[PDB]
Amino acid sequence: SIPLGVIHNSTLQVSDVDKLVCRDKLSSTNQLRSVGLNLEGNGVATDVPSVTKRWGFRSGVPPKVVNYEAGEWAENCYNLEIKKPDGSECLPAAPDGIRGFPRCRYVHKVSGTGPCAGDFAFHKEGAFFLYDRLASTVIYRGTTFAEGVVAFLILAA
Amino acid sequence: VIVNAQPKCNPNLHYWTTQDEGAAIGLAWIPYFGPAAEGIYTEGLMHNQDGLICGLRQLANETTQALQLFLRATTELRTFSILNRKAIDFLLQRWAA
Amino acid sequence: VIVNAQPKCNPNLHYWTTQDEGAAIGLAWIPYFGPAAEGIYTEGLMHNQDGLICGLRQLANETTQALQLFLRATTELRTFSILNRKAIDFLLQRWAA
């Protein structure tokens, strides 16, 4: 049930499958595009104690990932590393092919303890964590990420 | 038809990508002589043209829920075929008569 | 066209699936507030429409050999693209030349 939006004359219009005029032209597979945007461009706060409040631990769901093509310059980035009080780790190691965010000016690194209840950390709002051309639903250890969402578009003819 | 409803929207987009470069001259395309992992990106900048960026942010914010619902119903680990499937259905819709 | 030839064929089909749920109300679509690993399935029940359930228990049996041969001639570990290829050939057969 994925919606897509077409762009024409600098005008954006969200269209479904049956609403598709004959004017619409797709002559290559390079017109389809995917772009990931950040949340700090909407006015959301960026302070450290004002964003750790939206991540919570659960156990019982498996994670999933999708892929990216483009990005956007970021002002703030995050890099967490959390341990249990007894000395255990709370976050999973990164798999093969996962790398940090390419372009952002600041990076806030945090190391400390915490009451890890579940197994995976999710976002209480339904958004994504952004890595190098891969957008996930959970948090991997020691990899710089951003916070944002994804969009699918058909580019101008 | 998309009207932004966020408290604010930044009207300037500063973006990066990779592209393909088509042809190269020199010893650039050899992995033994080419760049490192960081250095393959091409940058740009765009200004607001009739609220394109704010509408774009609204569109992403609307899409998130359907994206999550689609992702819940698969057994894979990484997904690369959303656009190819979109093309397949776009082609299948019209060619029946 | 298919005629069953097993000693016994059950005429009742009690199945399960996952579906897509289209749109959801409440906080259910968020993975933080959603169901567990089991709880995403939707059930049903079907009765033996004339020569349909049992005539469907043979079409599977006939298939296996061919499928196995296909799986011998490939290098992938997991396969997800049989139906996409079927659609592509269906599109290519009629729409060409």
């Epitope: - | 998309i2 609307e62 829920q65 | -």
Partner: antibody, heavy 124, light 105 residues
Framework: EVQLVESGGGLVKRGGSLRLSCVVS????????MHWVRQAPGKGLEWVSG????????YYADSVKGRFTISRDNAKNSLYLQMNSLRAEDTAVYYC?????????????????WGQGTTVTVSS | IQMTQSPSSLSASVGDRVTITCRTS??????LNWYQQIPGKAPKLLIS???NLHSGVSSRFSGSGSGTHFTLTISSLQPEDFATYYC????????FGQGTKVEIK
Amino acid sequence: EVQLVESGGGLVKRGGSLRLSCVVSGYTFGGYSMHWVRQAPGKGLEWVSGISSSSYYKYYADSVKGRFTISRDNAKNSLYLQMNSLRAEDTAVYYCARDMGYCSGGSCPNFDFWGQGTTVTVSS
Amino acid sequence: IQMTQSPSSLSASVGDRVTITCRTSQSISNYLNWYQQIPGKAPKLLISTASNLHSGVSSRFSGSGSGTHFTLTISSLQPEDFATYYCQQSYSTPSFGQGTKVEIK
């Protein structure tokens, strides 16, 4: 000032159908989702259905599923509800309401501005 | 989910304190809203998320609670504050309350 005006209520025969409209002036209609609520004579409040900003998500209640249809129009700032196969329990006063969008499509409504309401009754 | 309210009806005089409760059959964190309706008038919004006062509402009203216990409080009566109160939830499919009418002695 947020102003909402309802219209279409009246008296109909059993087994019939009806259409209600809600018109809003004061702000940008195209950035918010809308919902419908009802109250029977001397009874409590009940939620009927709701729509989204791009007309991509539609919701219905079990008691009216398969009988009611919702729609909206951003250009003319209008909201429409179509009711079919009318029963005895469908005599009430109806309101159109707006919410603060804490969710992605209108999943978690928090009504902040209400209308006036219209009366619909069906009997012999 | 089932909604419970107590007391159902009440009569009070000017200068007292009014304390009301709303109850549910599940644990829904803090997704609760309170509404007030005057007979012959449409309902009106009040404190949201069980403690967030709206804009233009007098500071006398105050709500609190979480989990399965939620209490609304009015500190000083006023002649135009004799009407009905409702609670509504949004964790799952919407469902209003049963109502409560305050009166005079």
